[PDB]
């Protein structure tokens, strides 16, 4: 551990991105700090999931040698290679953080998830030739970018809000007004603290009936300014995002090799979190490396996931995580635990 | 105006004595403020509660632009008078407080911040010279008394604080068994605290008036203390290197005198005076060596009180606080407070 000060998860069967997935969401120290406050006395130590994040999250931040999963695995019923194959990493995080969000609802930290995760879009559908428009608003906690065809993030995010027509045999059932000519769209209307990005790295390919990789070229910056996709900008807090989490996968199938790179205070400092083994990476290794290979070679290790944090909010969402911030409560039913385990 | 700084004052509501002093003080222990906010306090009246009284003056202190009342505060521990404040000194109305809110505290995630924070240990000995008879008292300590009058300064103090007394002749001790015997009495510090209260001992009863006067005399204290030297056993993996924080100071030979704090909020030794209702930003040089007191050679304005935070422990004490750490809960409350009678 003391390479870094980062310890690794174990490698526990194949898990596909869930050692990926979770130092992401250790390394979103606010959310860390939240969990711990969870009040899980009561709760069943084998069936509560918050206990068992609660758990990893404790070990990660404590033991010196890789930590396990079994408990939290066997908690929210993932056990077998095909839960992972059958789940995007998406829904995973989802299955995590609801249970938690859950758990501290009536607690000091209620909310903790929404503030942090949950942005609000706007999708429309504008008729041409008559006075009728469609407004939903939707809540997300996670936005899914195209990458083919797209050079970069940029790109995919001029891709996600263009407006679409809907005419010829697309056009638009607008009841009382009959099918119409239309013109359907998605804005911002905010974007929250911590940005979860995942990248369309497979696609549904009819030649086989079966998904493929997309291995193609996509860059991502270090710095992503995205005031231009809000509806409207607030000259008090641009929305200027910073690099947190490059969650990475070499091969073309999930028997791939999945890790993550994060600099976990923000500071552009990388490691590179391969299940037990932490190290010290370039940012280049964390960046660039992970662009996915361009036509000529003739490269199948490439990110899938990203991770930003709002610049105006890193100080409060990477704010320093002291063992005084884990309640003496769970403190000793953790260790409780290790005596019964160690004897 | 607030902005003048970004810290705001307390009203001077009558003649409270130290009592705005002290409440910066504490209100600037982040990580003490941090535990107050996660108190439950559902159920407590609001003028019967102290408890909710320190939340609702932090809140305040946190979020007014306009001077802090304390009414609430002062009616629910019962410090009405002149006389109240006359007849305690500043560190009983600092235990009065710190005991409100621990106690608050127990059952919580925040249980057993208060000794955390500020109680340390020391053990008092006798040791009879001429027969084997020794008694040990340890004893916890939140604040140290320290002598000035014929000291020059906080490290001869310290000096004249673990010095050792010869009990003979006409004061020898008495040893049960053993009859009167000669010993010698001492102290010893077995540790000291995150945050250090070090209250000078600047009224000294005197027989000529049959009363108590203030000792005016210059009493010099440092920026940077270290305190190694008077632990038993010395720490190489923390040494005990303090950091001055606040310098509670009196003008005047009377109750009736001027009192206010200097801080430096943020550990970063950028000095603000708190004068009840006006805050100002001022020299390092106002805040110290202007408070040590008149050189005989010649002011009645000097320290009374200094509070120190150990080198190891400044970043968590003072970590940053944002309203994301005040639960949704509390604010509701002190808000609907605030709509009653605004109308
Ligand atoms: C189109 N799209 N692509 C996605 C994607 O890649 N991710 C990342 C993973 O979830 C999936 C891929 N792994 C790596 C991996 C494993 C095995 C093979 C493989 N096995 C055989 O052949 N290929 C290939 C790969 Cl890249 C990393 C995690 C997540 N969401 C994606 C979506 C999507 C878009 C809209 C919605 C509705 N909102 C839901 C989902
Ligand atoms: C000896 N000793 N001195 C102390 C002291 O100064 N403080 C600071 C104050 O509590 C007291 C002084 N005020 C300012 C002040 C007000 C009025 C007059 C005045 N008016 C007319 O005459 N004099 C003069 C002044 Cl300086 C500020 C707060 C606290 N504890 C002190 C102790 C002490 C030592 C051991 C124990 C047992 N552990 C208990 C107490």
Redesign the interface.
């Known amino acids: 551990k003391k390479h870094t000060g980062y310890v690794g998860l174990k490698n526990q069967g194949a898990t596909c991105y869930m050692n990926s997935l979770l130092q992401t969401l250790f390394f979103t120290n606010?959310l860390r700090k939240a969990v711990?406050?969870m009040p899980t006395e009561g709760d069943d130590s084998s069936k509560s999931v918050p206990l068992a994040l609660q758990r990893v999250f404790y070990e990660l931040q404590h033991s010196d040698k890789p930590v396990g999963t079994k408990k939290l695995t066997k908690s929210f019923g993932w056990e077998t290679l095909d839960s992972f194959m059958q789940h995007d990493v998406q829904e995973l995080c989802r299955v995590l953080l609801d249970n938690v969000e859950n758990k501290m609802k009536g607690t000091?930290?209620?909310?903790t998830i929404p503030?942090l995760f949950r942005g609000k879009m706007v999708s429309y559908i504008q008729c041409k030739e008559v006075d009728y428009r469609s407004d939903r608003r939707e809540d997300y906690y996670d936005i899914q970018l195209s990458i083919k065809g797209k050079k970069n993030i940029f790109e995919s995010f001029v891709d996600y809000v263009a407006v679409e027509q809907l005419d010829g045999d697309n056009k638009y059932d607008a009841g009382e007004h009959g099918l119409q000519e239309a013109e359907k769209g998605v804005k911002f209307l905010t974007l929250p603290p911590v940005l979860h990005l995942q990248l369309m790295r497979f696609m549904y390919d009819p030649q086989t009936d079966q998904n493929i990789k997309i291995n193609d070229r996509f860059e991502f910056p270090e710095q992503l300014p995205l005031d231009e996709f809000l509806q409207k900008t607030d000259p008090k807090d641009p929305a200027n995002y910073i690099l947190h989490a490059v969650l990475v996968h070499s091969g073309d199938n999930h028997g791939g090799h999945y890790v993550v790179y994060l600099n976990p205070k923000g500071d552009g400092k990388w490691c590179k979190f391969d299940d037990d083994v932490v190290s010290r990476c370039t940012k280049e290794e964390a960046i660039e490396h992970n662009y996915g290979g361009h036509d000529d070679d003739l490269h199948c290790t490439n990110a899938y996931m990203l991770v930003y944090i709002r610049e105006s909010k890193l100080?409060?969402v990477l704010?320093?995580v002291?063992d005084?911030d884990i309640?003496?409560?769970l403190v000793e039913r953790l260790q409780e635990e290790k005596r019964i385990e160690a004897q």
Do not use: D, L, N, R
């Open positions: 606010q711990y406050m000091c930290v209620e909310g503030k100080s409060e704010q320093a002291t005084h309640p003496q409560q």
